[PDB]
Amino acid sequence: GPLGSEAHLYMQVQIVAEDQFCGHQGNDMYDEEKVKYTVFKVLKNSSLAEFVQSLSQTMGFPQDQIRLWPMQARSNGTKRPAMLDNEADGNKTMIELSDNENPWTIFLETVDPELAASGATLPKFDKDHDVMLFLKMYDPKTRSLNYCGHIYTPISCKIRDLLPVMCDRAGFIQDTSLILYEEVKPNLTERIQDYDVSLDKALDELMDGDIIVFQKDDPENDNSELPTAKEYFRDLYHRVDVIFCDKTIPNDPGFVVTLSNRMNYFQVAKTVAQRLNTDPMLLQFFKSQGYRDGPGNPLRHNYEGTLRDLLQFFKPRQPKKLYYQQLKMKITDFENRRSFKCIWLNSQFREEEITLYPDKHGCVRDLLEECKKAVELGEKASGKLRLLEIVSYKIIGVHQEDELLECLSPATSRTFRIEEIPLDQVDIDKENEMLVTVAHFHKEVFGTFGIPFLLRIHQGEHFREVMKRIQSLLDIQEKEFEKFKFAIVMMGRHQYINEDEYEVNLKDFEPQPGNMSHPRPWLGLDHFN
Numbered sequence: 001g002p003l004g005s006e007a008h009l010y011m012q013v014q015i016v017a018e019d020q021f022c023g024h025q026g027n028d029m030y031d032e033e034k035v036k037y038t039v040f041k042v043l044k045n046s047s048l049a050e051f052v053q054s055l056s057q058t059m060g061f062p063q064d065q066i067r068l069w070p071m072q073a074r075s076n077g078t079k080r081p082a083m084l085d086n087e088a089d090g091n092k093t094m095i096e097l098s099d100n101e102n103p104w105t106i107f108l109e110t111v112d113p114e115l116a117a118s119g120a121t122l123p124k125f126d127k128d129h130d131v132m133l134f135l136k137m138y139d140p141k142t143r144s145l146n147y148c149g150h151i152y153t154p155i156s157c158k159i160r161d162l163l164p165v166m167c168d169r170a171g172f173i174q175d176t177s178l179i180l181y182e183e184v185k186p187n188l189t190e191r192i193q194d195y196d197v198s199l200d201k202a203l204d205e206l207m208d209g210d211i212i213v214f215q216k217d218d219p220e221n222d223n224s225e226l227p228t229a230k231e232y233f234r235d236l237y238h239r240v241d242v243i244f245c246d247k248t249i250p251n252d253p254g255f256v257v258t259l260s261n262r263m264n265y266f267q268v269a270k271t272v273a274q275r276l277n278t279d280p281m282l283l284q285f286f287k288s289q290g291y292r293d294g295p296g297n298p299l300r301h302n303y304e305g306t307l308r309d310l311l312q313f314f315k316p317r318q319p320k321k322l323y324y325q326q327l328k329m330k331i332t333d334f335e336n337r338r339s340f341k342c343i344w345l346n347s348q349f350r351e352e353e354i355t356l357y358p359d360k361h362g363c364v365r366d367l368l369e370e371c372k373k374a375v376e377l378g379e380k381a382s383g384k385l386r387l388l389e390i391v392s393y394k395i396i397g398v399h400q401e402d403e404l405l406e407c408l409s410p411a412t413s414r415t416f417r418i419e420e421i422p423l424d425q426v427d428i429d430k431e432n433e434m435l436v437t438v439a440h441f442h443k444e445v446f447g448t449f450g451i452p453f454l455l456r457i458h459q460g461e462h463f464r465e466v467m468k469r470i471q472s473l474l475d476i477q478e479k480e481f482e483k484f485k486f487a488i489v490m491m492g493r494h495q496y497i498n499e500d501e502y503e504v505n506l507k508d509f510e511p512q513p514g515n516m517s518h519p520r521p522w523l524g525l526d527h528f529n
């Protein structure tokens with residue numbers, strides 16, 4: 001709004017009283033966002049003597065029973081009460097004393113007016129020999145800080161001589177053994193190891209406004225989540241609230257979880273699984289996307305980073321959120337599963353698209369077993385399955401149940417097919433029977449189509465007995481079958497044979513002796529689709 005003619009000649013003095021230090025659970029004396037002040041609009045060029053005189057009348061106390069301690073920022077980022085000499089600096093301006101700080105905050109120390117009535121007065125402070133210390137009591141049972149006021153103490157005073165005051169102010173029985181710490185700054189609470197020394201030795205850079213945090217040395221402290229003041233402040237410093245959303249639930253508002261920035265994957269999962277009444281092993285988490293919102297890349301269960309590492313891209317404004325999903329299997333096995341898409345050839349000689357999920361480290365047997373569990377077999381068939389490999393409508397291979405799945409081609413040009421072994425093909429006479437690959441082709445051998453299949457052929461068998469065996473499987477009209485042309489194919493070369501000749505010798509379909517690698521001779525079926 002509109003500024004006054006002399007508004008620039010004024011400054012704001014914020015007076016904080018000791019009652020504002022009670023109940024504070026964080027570092028330093030109070031929270032800048034929760035603290036309540038007495039605000040003074042003071043001339044920048046008016047003296048300290050005037051303010052101390054004015055303030056005493058305003059606050060309702062004699063001038064000699066009040067002492068001002070300006071709130072001062074320290075090099076380490078803390079704000080603490082500092083010493084101010086009213087006798088020496090009484091004629092100095094408010095602006096030169098604040099060192100151009102506006103608003104200037106000052107701690108106002110006063111006697112308890114209840115005690116003042118019972119004789120009490122503000123003691124004299126020897127700026128060269130005395131120190132003003134603040135006392136806090138940490139209670140591991142309630143995991144909280146209790147304010148125990150301040151003391152005027154000589155710098156040369158032994159720590160051991162401060163223990164009766166601490167016990168008294170905390171409500172402990174005298175000669176209770178205590179653990180003492182110096183609250184240096186956030187995430188730095190240094191234990192006082194020797195009490196038989198002066199304050200100047202005991203504390204690093206002994207100053208006015210220094211804090212000693214103390215607690216009982218009790219075995220019951222160990223029963224607490226945070227047994228020491230040191231662990232309390234560390235937990236306070238690293239504390240972070242994160243929202244967790246289910247990736248599978250659309251527009252899920254999520255739930256808030258209080259975690260620590262230094263938590264590992266196991267610790268983050270264990271805490272979220274407790275809130276979901278699930279096993280941490282049955283949860284998958286996703287990284288952040290940084291710029292974009294929504295879930296990012298899936299987080300490996302063996303992630304070696306911290307929660308800080310996961311939340312580093314959220315801006316100060318940005319609310320911290322992480323996405324997850326609930327699994328119906330252990331995370332380790334879920335990560336190791338392979339999506340195996342194949343064809344299932346049913347009893348009716350019809351093809352069906354099936355997706356099986358064996359473990360990537362499994363074998364052909366495991367894929368077949370997964371399939372056996374999913375389908376209905378023949379009326380009274382073998383109950384044994386096989387995995388074929390088809391490329392360009394031809395069977396290029398029959399895989400043994402012992403073969404690793406990792407060996408099977410990931411290429412899109414391969415078609416893997418599972419089927420039930422026909423009764424006649426379970427245990428053939430190795431001396432006079434043979435399994436041959438059959439495939440349909442239109443005019444030219446390269447022009448293959450249809451569903452290929454394995455066929456049993458016998459030594460010196462009548463080729464029409466082979467023909468009716470083919471007809472019984474294909475199952476079409478007898479006049480459609482008479483149009484067919486039967487030929488044997490091997491390495492491009494193909495010879496057509498007479499249906500009435502009946503010439504069947506296993507050597508005609510066998511490859512060269514000792515060559516199993518070379519594409520074995522097959523039987524072609526000429527017609528059109």
Ligand SMILES: [Cl-]
Binds near residue numbers: 237238261
């Ligand atoms: Cl942190």
